[PDB]
A paper describes a structure:
STEP is a brain-specific PTP, and a validated therapeutic target for Alzheimer’s disease, Fragile X syndrome, and Parkinson’s disease. To compare the effects of temperature vs. pressure on the STEP catalytic domain, we used similarly prepared crystals to obtain three complementary crystal structures: one at cryogenic temperature (100 K) and ambient pressure (0.1 MPa), one at physiological temperature (310 K) but ambient pressure, and one at high pressure (205 MPa) but cryogenic temperature via high-pressure cryocooling. For the remainder of this paper, we refer to the structure at low temperature and low pressure as LoTP, the structure at high temperature as HiT, and the structure at high pressure as HiP. All three structures have the expected PTP catalytic domain architecture, including several key loops surrounding the active site region.
Author numbering: 256 to 537
The structure:
């Protein structure tokens, strides 16, 4: 909707101009959802944040266990277009709360999601995210989740997981990124860029028409928007030799209100893309 195509030089300078960045960022409408849209008793129990709600056109609806029950079928999640508008590359969702852990896994099963990206720091567990995976094994509304392996790396912990419901077995990779910075300075960009590249490469290993990749921290918009915007713009940089973070943010906002919630987040994406362009140029 809005657009600012950045070539390399402007990109490096734009990332370092916070006055222009906030001018640009706060012109982007949030596109938040009127809470009246989900006037369903008990629904507020499924939301972490009463005013961060899934836009209805892109909302993920659960069909299990009662599709005729608007509360049973509700999850605070949206399909998110990827690079070039490709449909349903991601699902942005809130960190599960105790009342929605089973819903979250129902989503993962329903959507054939191969990859979860969790952008939540150690400190913020059981406040910004319920530990929704087992030590080894656990079962939710019919799907058995088995953590087969944990790979620790500097920037993230990767769990290899198996999901079994009845006769069907599927794999899942759970990337738990733990280096989200408090200060979104350029020295903190490399781990995010690394994660984006590792995830986009895991995604390619799933083959054609990869099922949606679930991305979350707490509300499903801020860090989640940063990760998705960075992933999209990395493809844009590789394919087009430019980045349009403003247009990408608008595309994200159209899918889910509030994606990239803070100007510090918005500037961080620019720091990450500036770093990546330098890497690519060598």
């Amino acid at each position: 909707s809005m657009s600012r195509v950045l070539q390399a030089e402007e990109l490096h300078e734009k990332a370092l101009d916070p006055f222009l960045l906030q001018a640009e960022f706060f012109e982007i409408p949030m596109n938040f959802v009127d809470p009246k849209e989900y006037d369903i008793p008990g629904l507020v129990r499924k939301n972490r944040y009463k005013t961060i709600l899934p836009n209805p056109h892109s909302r993920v609806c659960l069909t299990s266990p009662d599709p005729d029950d608007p509360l049973s079928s509700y999850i605070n999640a949206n399909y998110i277009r990827g690079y070039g508008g490709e449909e349903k590359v991601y699902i942005a969702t809130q960190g599960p709360i105790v009342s929605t852990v089973a819903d979250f896994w129902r989503m993962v099963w329903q959507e054939h999601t191969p990859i979860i990206v969790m952008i939540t720091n150690i400190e913020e567990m059981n406040e910004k995210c319920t530990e929704y995976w087992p030590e080894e094994q656990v079962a939710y509304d019919g799907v058995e989740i088995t953590v087969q392996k944990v790979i620790h790396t500097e920037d993230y912990r990767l769990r290899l997981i198996s999901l079994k419901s009845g006769t069907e077995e599927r794999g899942l990779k759970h990337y738990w990124f733990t280096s989200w910075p408090d200060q979104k300075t350029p020295d903190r960009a490399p781990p995010l860029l690394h994660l984006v590249r590792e995830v986009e490469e895991a995604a390619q290993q799933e083959g054609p028409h990869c099922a949606p990749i679930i991305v979350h921290c707490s509300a499903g918009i801020g860090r989640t928007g940063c990760f998705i915007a960075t992933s999209i713009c990395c493809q844009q940089l590789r394919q087009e030799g430019v980045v349009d973070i403003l247009k990408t943010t608008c595309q994200l906002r159209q899918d889910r209100g509030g994606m990239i919630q803070t100007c510090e987040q918005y500037q961080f994406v620019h720091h990450v893309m500036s770093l990546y362009e330098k890497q690519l140029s060598h």
